[PDB]
Amino acid sequence: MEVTVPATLNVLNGSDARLPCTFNSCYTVNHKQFSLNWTYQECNNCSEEMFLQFRMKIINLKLERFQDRVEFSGNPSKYDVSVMLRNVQPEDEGIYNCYIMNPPDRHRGHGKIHLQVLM
Amino acid sequence: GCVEVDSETEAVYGMTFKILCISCKRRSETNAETFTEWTFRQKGTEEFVKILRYENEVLQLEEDERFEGRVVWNGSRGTKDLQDLSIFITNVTYNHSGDYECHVYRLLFFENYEHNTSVVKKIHIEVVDKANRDMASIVSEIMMYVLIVVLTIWLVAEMIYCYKKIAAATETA
Amino acid sequence: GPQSFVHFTKQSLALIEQRIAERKSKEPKPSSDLEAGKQLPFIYGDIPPGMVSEPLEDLDPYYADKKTFIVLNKGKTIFRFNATPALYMLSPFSPLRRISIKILVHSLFSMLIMCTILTNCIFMTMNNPPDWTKNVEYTFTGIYTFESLVKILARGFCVGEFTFLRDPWNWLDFVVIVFAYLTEFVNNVSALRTFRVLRALKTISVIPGLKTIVGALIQSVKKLSDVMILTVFCLSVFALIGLQLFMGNLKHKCFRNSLENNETLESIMNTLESEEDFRKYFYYLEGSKDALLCGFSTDSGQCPEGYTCVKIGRNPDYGYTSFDTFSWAFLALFRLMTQDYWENLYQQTLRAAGKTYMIFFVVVIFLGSFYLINLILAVVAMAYEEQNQANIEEAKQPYWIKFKKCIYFIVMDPFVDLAITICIVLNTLFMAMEHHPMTEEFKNVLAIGNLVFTGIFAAEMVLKLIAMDPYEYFQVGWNIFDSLIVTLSLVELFLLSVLRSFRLLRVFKLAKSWPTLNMLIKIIGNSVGALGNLTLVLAIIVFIFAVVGMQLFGKSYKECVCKINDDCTLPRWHMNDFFHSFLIVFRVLCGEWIETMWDCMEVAGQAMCLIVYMMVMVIGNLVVLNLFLALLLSSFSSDNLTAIEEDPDANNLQIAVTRIKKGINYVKQTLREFILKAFGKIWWNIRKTCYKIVEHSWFESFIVLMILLSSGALAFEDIYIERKKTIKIILEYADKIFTYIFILEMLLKWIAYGYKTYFTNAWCWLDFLIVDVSLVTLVANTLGYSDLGPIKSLRTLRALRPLRALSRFEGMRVVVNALIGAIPSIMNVLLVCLIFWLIFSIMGVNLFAGKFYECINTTDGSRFPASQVPNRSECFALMNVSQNVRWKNLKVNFDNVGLGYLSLLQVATFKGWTIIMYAAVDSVNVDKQPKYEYSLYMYIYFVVFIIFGSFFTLNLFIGVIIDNFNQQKKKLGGQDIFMTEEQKKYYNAMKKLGSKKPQKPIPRPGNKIQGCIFDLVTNQAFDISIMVLICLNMVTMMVEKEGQSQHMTEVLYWINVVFIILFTGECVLKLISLRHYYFTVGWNIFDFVVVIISIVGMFLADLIETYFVSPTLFRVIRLARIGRILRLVKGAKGIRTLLFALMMSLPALFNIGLLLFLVMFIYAIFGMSNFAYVKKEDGINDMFNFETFGNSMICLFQITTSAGWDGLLAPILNSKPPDCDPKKVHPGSSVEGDCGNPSVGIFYFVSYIIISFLVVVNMYIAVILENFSVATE
């Protein structure tokens, strides 16, 4: 599917970062089968860390590297699976992936955002 | 397809008789599994007594004198979805007179749904010495003959009158 | 004169400006021959060499005073431009403008633009263009910018009169160029392609003679104004009636009774999404997407045991089929008017509301789909006729020499050409013996026969080519065509499957001697000859529609695919690529648009698909109708003028016939000569008495009554006759009485008329045959022969007793007389059609013989893939392995020529054709499992057959039907052929109604207040206010919808009450004012009656809805609300005229309807006798079958329009197991077996559809005669 994400996002230290990820799927998002998979990797060839997932509801894995600063800021029914990172810290810099699966649409979606944090 | 015809109410002594019990499912394309039970109440008695049961291509008879060795199966054959449940009596006697109850126990099979139904049909049969002719046939034949004779007489009278008139006209000319 | 040629110089411009100044100080039409875009008159002769392609003065005196100049190309085409400088910079004498004019007026310019547009159109067909297409797209944009700049530079931009922007077709070029550049700079891609497709419309302005066709098509539309208004009005009234009758009925479903876990319908209906879970609570037939429909009456559909009928859930067909709102009701009524899949809607409505509502469909079909189509069609006929009349009115205003001469002598017309004709007939009959289960010996003999025929044809080809000179030989077109056929024959000899079938085109060589085949050839030639421009326009429109659909909805079909297909694969019909998009457009033109429209609205939205489909239908149908009319009347009147004699050069066939007349007669006479050398007033009075009795009116009435009784006695012999012992006995004895009475009638007729007179009459012969069959049946039954097979097959011939009613009723007699008069002309056009269809049948047999077999999984009816079981032997391995496996084949296919004829009949009528086309495009080979669209481009065969064997075939048929009925009318003095003498008198009396002069004005009343009322009600303001009030009432009734709240119900009720009090009041005012003159006008009588029905029906409906329980009756009397809106036809004069034409056409329609009903009755009795116990599959089910008289009439009315006749025929074609069971036991009856008789079924259905087609054509022409009579008088 078409996934609309910003290639690079620049966020100030201590400010709030909304991570936009929207997908254009023909079929209505049914919450009982819809799948959302948010991962984080330091580099393109680095390991991905699960920190948020929507299997039936929003499941926050609560990673230690993020403390309790990861929150969901989208709405699946309106094709929005964005998340927000409160009080951005320098180690939040990396690559964030939003994987989308919306049955009965066959293909798998993937949006990649490079979050750069400046002073 | 399937037609529910009523059983005849008159059986003659010493001969064979078939009692019809036809129960058609409301939709033909449905699948079911049916078995039947027959009950008989004789004249002079007020209690209905079971006399046979048919299920899974085998006929079970109760131990009763009036029906032992005289009844066979004339219903649906080769299937569990029975829509004809009629039996057949070989030597009708005077104690076969009475009213019958045909209990049909059909188990419909739907998608995630089983419906157990039941229907009852009542057949009252008369046992007499000689087959009484139906009123319908007698009266219908009588009206056929009277209508034929009336039409013929009317036509003949009309030809007579017209021939007399045209003969008078011919003599006048 | 011709000498008037001079270069446009500055002195001439100064003179023109001086003349303009003189005209201003002082302060007409031009020559159409000299009008822009025309040929220069021959009176001017040739052009001086220095004069061509140069600015020269204005020839027309009208523009001689104004500032213009003319330019001439090398084809003598004048162009009128403006002398004012182009944007005040470029002057006429400037070399830049000179070069621009030189480029503008040339052939290499138009050819270059044509090639560019065609290449661009070819490039628009690609759905996923590669990356090397963008440079080509820039090149196309540059070429268009070039021509736009040239035209702007040469003609000026906007300021002048003959300028770039004044041309309406130049706005399209401007819009294209600005869209291209602007959308390129700004960057929906699909939108940008819907803006790029407009370049396909530039073909109209570059191919010459297309603007004229477009203008004529625009003119044909403008004459359709009033008929469109009447169509909208009738569709809206029928939609309101259907909304009232069927609101919410298509949402009935069979809901299960026993629910566990304390569950309820309302709770369940909120937690159901998938059909897999809907199937657990509602009842679905296997393989059905929608739930089964039910009803609450005894004549509606019945739920299975354990399910109860409830109104809940969505409507069928994704929810698009309903009568819930006025919008969907109007869509359904439009569908009924166009008869697109209308049998499905008819079946659903009967299932959900009851069989008694078939009256609504009868009335709707007969009034809309017949009469309104007749009106549109006849108005198009007038428009083109006036166009053609104006056109014709204004248009009129040594050794080698020896042996070649020997060969030329060998060429001899009486025998050689006759021998070749015989050889052609033998060859086509020989190639008609191919079939699928063919032994190798039969194949070998067919091969040697086809080889020897080709050899002898090539021998003819070479012998002629050496007899006459090669330059002389190729002069005749027939010789050239024979040469092409021969060379392709040799080519295939040296070597596809279609190439084998190009030999059948030699059949057209018989058109030299066959006159009505030459008519079809001339029609086909005119389609690409005198009417080539209109056909080209139609092709352009089809291409544009296909590409527009592909661009708009192509990606939606792929992304939204799982909504319209469970396997998440593209359906059979879609618009993902150009070919399938074009197939959808062609199918819509054939008349099937609703089913693809449902998928389009599911994938891409309702509004877009609705607009696109309506526009495609309107434009395409209009252009196809114009092409049909032009072809029909051109070939009817313009082509045939008897310019030459019948075969002016004595036909070789006629020379052979003369030689045969000499020879056979002479030989027979010589043989006869050789044989001769070798060797009582009483009886006359009785006859008069019988004459007196038979010819009396009472005898006729008695016989008519007994015929009616005997015919009605046949309707009772359904499958339930054994529940009605008494009536069965009465019917038997009554049949005996009827036989007696008709024996007596026959004897009386014999004595009165005599054997000679009795047996010269055909009606008497029919009665004699029927009565003889009845007597034989009675004597067989009496003598104990009641169960013999021949006797049991004779007893089914009692369905022919209603044929005795033909001679008793004058309407059926005159309609039958007209039909028998038409027969002889129909026979020849039937023979031509059989030959044309035999060609296609042989081609289809060659293409598809034995390739429709497949290995299917019987329990679910799905073809196995081709990865597993790709062969017949693998299929047999799996049959002997898995039980539910079968290598079955289609019932209707191309195994032989007869089955090919049946397939072609199904395709031409567009009923059951889709299965055939799917099997054809999936075909691989013999004994090979089909693969999905392996032979995808086999759709071309079906498209070509549809065109040639439907469009042109029906064109020829109706073209001959027109002349036949015209000569029928002429010979009897111009009287109507479908009406009786009394009906003729009433027809005249109705004609004087619509032509009365203005009657005496109603006299005003002497009273003051009454005079005020008189001057009020008689004003036109009163009438127009009445019309707007009726329109507001119509809107109020349109607001009603399914599921509306009680507040809306109360509001609408009070508004309707207020309207009733207003209308009743207006009636009281008119009654007070006009006094007794109110009733002297029929329209006021209708108004008074309808206001009475409105009041009474509203009160009665309130009474029933408050103090009674009868929703059906409530709706039936609330239908009385329609009468108020029927008063709108009073103000509309045109729609009033069409309704008057319908009223005039009613009597003949009554006679033809009586004939059709009698034929339907006979076929109903036959169907009850034959197909009562056939398996309930395909179109035969629990409600639509031949078990009873009502069901049979339901089924026959459906296929009177040919709708769904394949679905009815299919269960009959089962003859052997495992298709049917010959020993099926039916409880309550002694009939055994559920098999059908394929031959009887085929004859039944084909004969019925043909007869219905003929009768419908009769009703058509009746309405056309009435329509043309009304408007042109």
Ligand SMILES: *[C@@H]1O[C@H](CO)[C@@H](O[C@@H]2O[C@H](CO)[C@@H](O)[C@H](O)[C@H]2NC(C)=O)[C@H](O)[C@H]1NC(C)=O
């Ligand atoms: C029909 O198609 C099947 C597809 O599997 C062909 O396969 C044969 O299968 C048998 C047993 O599995 C093998 O012994 C053969 O060697 C296979 N054929 C080939 C060509 O490898 C089968 O041959 C086909 N039959 C015909 C008559 O073409």
Ligand SMILES: *[C@@H]1O[C@H](CO)[C@@H](O)[C@H](O)[C@H]1NC(C)=O
């Ligand atoms: C039936 O059995 C009885 C008992 O003996 C006998 O009298 C009668 O004749 C039998 N009838 C037939 C038809 O066998």
Ligand SMILES: *[C@@H]1O[C@H](CO)[C@@H](O)[C@H](O)[C@H]1NC(C)=O
């Ligand atoms: C019929 O039943 C009666 C019961 O009263 C019995 O007496 C009689 O013997 C029975 N007859 C036959 C033939 O079984």
Ligand SMILES: *[C@@H]1O[C@H](CO)[C@@H](O)[C@H](O)[C@H]1NC(C)=O
């Ligand atoms: C009704 O449903 C409820 C579910 O909350 C259940 O507890 C209760 O027993 C049900 N009542 C009956 C009569 O089944």
Ligand SMILES: *[C@@H]1O[C@H](CO)[C@@H](O)[C@H](O)[C@H]1NC(C)=O
């Ligand atoms: C295929 O069918 C049978 C099963 O009925 C199987 O056992 C056997 O191998 C095969 N028989 C024949 C006759 O091909």
